[PDB]
């Protein structure tokens, strides 16, 4: 074989990418929600 | 062929999954950071 494999690879590439995307996004909302949470800690 | 393909599929499955995972996580930090942001809007 030599066609459906390479393709499945390109697909696994776009998937792993988007993953790192939403990953960094959640990382930003996490660090920010952490500093904010601490500021809320006072009651 | 009949082995490396099915495998590449199972892999694309775990990838798409984790993707939906970090996706919902960012969705929670987004809706929460949105309601909070509004509360901060007052200065």
Swiss-Prot record, chains A, B:
The modification Phosphothreonine is found at residue 14. Residues 8-36 are annotated as: Leucine-zipper. Signal peptide: none annotated. Expressed in the developing and adult prostate and prostate cancer cells. Residues 1-43 form the bZIP domain. Ubiquitinated by the SCF(FBXW7), leading to its degradation. Ubiquitination takes place following phosphorylation, that promotes interaction with FBXW7. Transmembrane segments: none annotated. It is found in: Nucleus. Belongs to the bZIP family. Jun subfamily. Transcription factor that recognizes and binds to the AP-1 consensus motif 5'-TGA[GC]TCA-3'. Heterodimerizes with proteins of the FOS family to form an AP-1 transcription complex, thereby enhancing its DNA binding activity to the AP-1 consensus sequence 5'-TGA[GC]TCA-3' and enhancing its transcriptional activity. Together with FOSB, plays a role in activation-induced cell death of T cells by binding to the AP-1 promoter site of FASLG/CD95L, and inducing its transcription in response to activation of the TCR/CD3 signaling pathway. (Microbial infection) Upon Epstein-Barr virus (EBV) infection, binds to viral BZLF1 Z promoter and activates viral BZLF1 expression. Heterodimer with either BATF3 or ATF7. Heterodimer with FOS. Heterodimer with FOSB isoform 1 and 2. Component of an AP-1 transcription factor complex composed of JUN-FOS heterodimers. As part of the AP-1 transcription factor complex, forms heterodimers with FOSB, thereby binding to the AP-1 consensus sequence and stimulating transcription. Interacts with FOS and FOSB isoform 1 and 2. The ATF7/JUN heterodimer is essential for ATF7 transactivation activity. Interacts with TSC22D3 (via N-terminus); the interaction inhibits the binding of active AP1 to its target DNA. This is Transcription factor Jun. The lineage of its organism: Eukaryota, Metazoa, Chordata, Craniata, Vertebrata. The gene is JUN.
